[PDB]
Amino acid sequence: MSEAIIAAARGRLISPPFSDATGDVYRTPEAALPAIIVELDYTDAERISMGGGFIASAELRVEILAKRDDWSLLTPTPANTAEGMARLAALVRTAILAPPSDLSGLAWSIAPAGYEFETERGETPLARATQSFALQILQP
Amino acid sequence: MSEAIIAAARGRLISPPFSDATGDVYRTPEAALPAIIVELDYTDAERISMGGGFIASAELRVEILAKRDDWSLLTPTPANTAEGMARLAALVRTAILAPPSDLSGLAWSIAPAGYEFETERGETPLARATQSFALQILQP
Amino acid sequence: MSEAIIAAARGRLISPPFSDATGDVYRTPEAALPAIIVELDYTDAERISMGGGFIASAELRVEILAKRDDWSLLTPTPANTAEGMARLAALVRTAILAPPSDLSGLAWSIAPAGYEFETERGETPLARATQSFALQILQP
Amino acid sequence: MSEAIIAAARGRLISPPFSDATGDVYRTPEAALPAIIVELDYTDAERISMGGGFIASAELRVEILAKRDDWSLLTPTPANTAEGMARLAALVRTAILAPPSDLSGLAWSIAPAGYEFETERGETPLARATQSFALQILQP
Amino acid sequence: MSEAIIAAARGRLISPPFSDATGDVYRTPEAALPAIIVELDYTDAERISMGGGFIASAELRVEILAKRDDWSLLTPTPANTAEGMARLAALVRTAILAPPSDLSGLAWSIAPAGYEFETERGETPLARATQSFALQILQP
Amino acid sequence: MSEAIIAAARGRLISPPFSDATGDVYRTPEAALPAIIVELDYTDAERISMGGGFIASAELRVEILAKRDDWSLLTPTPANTAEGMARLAALVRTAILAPPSDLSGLAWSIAPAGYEFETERGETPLARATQSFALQILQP
Amino acid sequence: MLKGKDGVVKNASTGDSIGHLQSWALDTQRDEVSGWGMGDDAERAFTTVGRASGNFEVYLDPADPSDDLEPGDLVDLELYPGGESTGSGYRSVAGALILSTAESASKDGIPMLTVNWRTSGALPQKATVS
Amino acid sequence: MLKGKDGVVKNASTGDSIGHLQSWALDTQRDEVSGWGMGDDAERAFTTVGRASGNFEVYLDPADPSDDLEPGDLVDLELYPGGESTGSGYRSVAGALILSTAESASKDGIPMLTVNWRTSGALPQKATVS
Amino acid sequence: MLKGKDGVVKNASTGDSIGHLQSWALDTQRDEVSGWGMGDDAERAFTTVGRASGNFEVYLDPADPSDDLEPGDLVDLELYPGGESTGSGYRSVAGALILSTAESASKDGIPMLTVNWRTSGALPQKATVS
Amino acid sequence: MLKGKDGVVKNASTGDSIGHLQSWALDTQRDEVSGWGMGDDAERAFTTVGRASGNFEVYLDPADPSDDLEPGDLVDLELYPGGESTGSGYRSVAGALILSTAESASKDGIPMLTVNWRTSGALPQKATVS
Amino acid sequence: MLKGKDGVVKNASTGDSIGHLQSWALDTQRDEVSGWGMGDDAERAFTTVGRASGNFEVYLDPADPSDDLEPGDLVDLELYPGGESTGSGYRSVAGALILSTAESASKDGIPMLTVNWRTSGALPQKATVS
Amino acid sequence: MLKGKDGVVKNASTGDSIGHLQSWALDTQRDEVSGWGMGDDAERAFTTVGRASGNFEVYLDPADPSDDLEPGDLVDLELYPGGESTGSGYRSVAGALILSTAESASKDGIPMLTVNWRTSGALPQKATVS
């Protein structure tokens, strides 16, 4: 159930103080400097039991775009892309990979599939961070 | 038998209130905002028994293109691509993966091979959803 | 022996009432609306016995190009690419995968490796169908 | 020893009545309509025995380019690319994969790795045929 | 914890007498002829224990850009790219793969995944060296 | 230790009577018709023992560029690319894969990973030959 | 060619399907006695007595009767290889005695239970469902 | 080099092909007696008596005679390795005794039956079909 | 379908979870006695006595009670397949006797300990947690 | 380093190569007797008697003598590891006794026969062909 | 979670680390005696005596004491699973008797030696390093 | 860390290297006797007698002494794990008795011979080459 998992993510990632927009093609803003977007992506699948059941292999991708003081919350040198991206990412990782059961349950495993920091040259420097989380969800 | 399976699909996917056109190259309309198309795709194969039989590995791809209130049937925020695509997709998944035997029988396994939501920037926003279903069909 | 297998194919696929031309680069006609072409393709290989023998893994590709009433022989909606392509293909499959021994013998296994329907936008709509058949032939 | 194997090939493929030129970049002639070229290609490798030895995995590629009556030696329809290419290729296969020991010995296995027929649109039609033969040769 | 590992790297690679800048898109200087940059890159992952734990597969990439006498510290012919790159790299390898425990501990394995020397034609010749080090870090 | 292995190679390949230049980007000469260049390339790696050790998988690539009489040292037809390249290559192979222990020791295995002959159309014809040798070297 | 994803095994006495099952198996065997004499080319043989056994595997369950079965219990088992659809054959074993049960788990997997049974005093009887 | 996809095994007595078969096997064995004496370099040997056995596997069937065979049954089996085409050799075993049968299935697979047989009082006889 | 990544095994007497565990297993078995007579088609059977055994694997630990258990020790083990959440079943074995322990390591891996236990005088008792 | 794709095994008595063969094997063994006494560091040993055995596999054949060999037959076998080219060694076994033969097939494969032999009264003798 | 790449095994008597080691193992076992009576549901058990064994593998060495150990030797072995860092536990076995040693090599690999040991008269004692 | 691609095994008596070898192995073993009494925690043990064995594999050879060795032969074998370079250790076994030899081939492979040996009356002696 993507909507529900996305909804959990929507609640789980709305906490950073900035709007999260997912799949808005027309939108490509720079005004919303701190940027968050969560994607449920794809689900591959296999049978469960004899007499009925299905399970899926699914990937959740979280992407963050940022500039300036958003990086500089506390520690020095978050302008450095790596430190800044890591600083936002680890907490984000804990947000999604949190202890609460509802968030964990529909997700089953919540392992970090991948991590990345990327650099795009804008006046204000913009950097992209990806946090793939692999969740296996039983097909309803 | 692609035609029969496609026919089952044709019956199974004609229910959303909009026409389904498959493989029409010349046609690329925007007037039919809610859009559905079902493809039987490819069949790989292996032998059955001694003395004769064949079975195939086959993929069925279902694609949906949509804009505006088609997304907004009931729940809020289906403009969000993920929620909207999921909303149409899950029911579609149940349509094809339905309990009726005839639909299930020629199909054998009906597992969701893949899922996706895609974004194209039109005045009205158009979003593409793919629902690969893997069916193994005995070659007649 | 490609020529012989191709010859068997030549006899086996000449039955649809239209000429079959294979590997004619200069030729790319639209006048021959119903179109058939058979290709022996490639042969990979391994040893047989001790003291001498060789066997090959080989692929035979059959391609069909069509427009209009060629699709509409009997059942309705063969304009739909999938139904039309399937309609011609299944019979073609039976032609090549026929019971006669000579056709079967040099071919050994005759499994359908793959299937496809494709769409090209001509005034008259033209659609391409591929029917790979895998034949393992003992190298003479 | 590529030169020796190539030399064996040079003797073995010089028999068709036309010159064989290998690796001549500047040369790209149409006057030599029937065309033959043999390439020793690459050698991958592994150890032999304890105390010393090496063996290689090697590929020999034979390519034929042809037009007109060269195809039409005896049987009808060799203009058809497949028949024509096969007609030249099988005999070529026997030439290289011949019984003589010297040719076989430095070559060890002489299996046909691959086969192909290709089409290029010249006034006179030109068609390319590839006959990869895999030979494992002990490194001297 | 990328920041900490990057911080260890930051301390560990700051020793060559030149600044290290990581992920600065706008910056592409030639004034800082000797150049160093360290990237934590990506982390794939798997479960630990029953009841909780996670571990990651991670890659650390170190890149060096250089010209002139930076190559020529002591031995002759470091202009030769290979010697020069190796000369800087081996010591760098020892820096990161050093005996100190803190550096080793968060890193666990510190194996050299890959090595490379690259050539770009500037008035002063510039050469790029990559030293991937694979560190498996327990997810906090 | 790339420098040392490269140094061994430097001594081992300096014998053909022409200069060897490695990684010179600006340089692309035609005056040095016979051409030799040796590259240590990349090193992948794994642990050794318990308590400490590392070993690497490494590739050494040797490339030769040549024209005219350099090919024609003794035997006829070395203009033919294959014969000429092989003629230089086999001796080169023996040079690097020589019996002397020092050359062999830091190299451990010296197997020919790959071989190739290539053709570029210059007034004087230039041909490229590659002789990958795989050496596994213990990381110091 | 039954599908095999629809197989249902039910305890006949309490009328409950066992649960989410991974796999089932059945076997029937009859022992052999062979005798030959001096001067004889081949050995003659005969079959004396018969036994049957089988096993089934299911994900561990606290909400189903999967939980209840115990070693030593005597149960009546009806097994439908192709399901309960009309005209589908069912193998019915009476007086099945459950010799052993085994529970296992791993960090990355669902807990599983395997039950092994033998037949006592009876032989499995094939029959066709209405 | 028979093709092996055309092999047919038929019960001779009731004249029915067994069904969709996966695989067949046959074996023939003769026991050995070895003796050596003090002072002898090699050991002499002789063969005394012979037995034959085999097994075949088929997808589970409720519409074919595959269903009927039972452990303990005595049957006549004619096996055609290369089919029934004229001039194809057939191995005929008389008085085959079916020792055991085994049914199995999994969630992702078709149900299968394996039958094991021995010969009683006879040895397989090769013959060539008309 | 318990998750299986939350399983906790605790020593009941000292109240400590064992440690970072890789896997757990349990088995219960009852022996069989079969008898048949001259003239009887099937063999009757009965189950006589019961034993239980199991094993668990954990990364080697110097900071946890994982370290303390020793061969020959008698311990009370409560195993929670699905965790200690309310309503989750727990298998409790009393008087578990630890027959053997095995420590191993490799150059590329974490050190591991495997403990094997048997039951003495008691049988595992299923129960449901509050 | 014989090539091994040219090996020919021929029945010496009837002078026919066996057929399309997949593989061959031979073995020679001599038994050991060991004795040690009180107060002795090492154990002395000696070899007493010798036997040889081997097996060969060939695609099933109705047109060749592959078909004829039977368990219990006594045959003379000459095996050429490197072929019959002059100067190639041949292993000749006299009085080979064929203990067993096994035929098998599968849906996707060619039928195969495996023959196992032992030596009676003789030991394999190496010799070099003219 | 000890790292396992830092494990050191040292011969206590001569104070030398063994050498470049691939892997180590240890095991401890105590035998079981079970008894049940007529009319009893479960079988009681007790543990009687204990033995320990282990093995270690190292690349073949002519420059280290790896070379010296011999079958039959009695040695004192101290094994540090996590290294000799302060506070790291060490398993010390006294009177270890080396039953067997095995040397092997292949064309593509480094020569290796495997040593197997048993304990005589003592049991491994856990202790914590200073 | 000897390289292992340079290992040479030579027959000491005739002074010839064996041939193109794939692999070598050696083992040394001493038997164990254990005794415990009523009231004792651990079991004491001692080692009584020693034997050694090994095997080597080589491509089949008609031009080398590889061909000559036969089961039952007594030979002196000197094995150099790291080659004959000065200062390289050699394992020398005297009175090696060759119990068995095995020849095999396949359609796609080179013929191979495996020789197995035991020691009679002596134990392998390590020594360092000049």
Author numbering:
A (entry chain o), B (entry chain n), C (entry chain m), D (entry chain l), E (entry chain k), F (entry chain p): 1 to 140
G (entry chain e), H (entry chain i), I (entry chain j), J (entry chain h), K (entry chain f), L (entry chain g): 1 to 130
Can I see the authors' text?
The adaptor docks to the stopper hexameric ring, with the latter formed by stopper proteins (vBDshSR4C_009) that maintain DNA inside the capsid. The stopper protein, a crucial module for head assembly, shares common structural features (anti-parallel β-strands barrel) with other siphophages, myophages and phage-like entities. The R4C stopper protein, with its long N-terminal extension, folds part of the N-terminus as an α-helix and plays a critical role in connecting the adaptor. Intriguingly, the R4C inter-stopper contact area (~274 Å2) formed by the N-termini, short loop, insertion loop and β2, seems too small for complex formation: we speculate that, similar to other tailed phages, the stopper proteins may exist as monomers in solution and form the stopper hexamer when incorporated into the head. As we described, the R4C terminator operates as a docking platform for the preassembled head and tail. Despite low sequence similarity, the R4C terminator protein shares a common structural topology with that of other long-tailed phages (e.g., λ phage gpU11, SPP1 gp1771), and integrates elements of a multi-stranded β-sheet barrel and two main helices at the periphery. The central α-helices and β3 cling to the neighbouring terminator surface, which is composed of an N-terminal helix, an insertion domain, and a segment of β1. The interaction between the R4C terminator and the tail tube relies chiefly on the tips of the terminator long β-hairpins binding to the minor groove, which is formed by adjacent tail tube subunits. Residue M50 in the β-hairpin tip inserts deeply into the hydrophobic cavity at the interaction interface to further stabilize layer coupling.
We recently characterized a novel roseophage, vB_DshS-R4C (R4C), that could infect the Dinoroseobacter shibae DFL12T, a ubiquitous group of Gram-negative α-proteobacteria of the Roseobacter clade. Here, we report the atomic capsid and in-situ structures of the tail machine of the marine siphophage, vB_DshS-R4C (R4C), which infects Roseobacter. The R4C virion, comprising 12 distinct structural protein components, has a unique five-fold vertex of the icosahedral capsid that allows genome delivery.
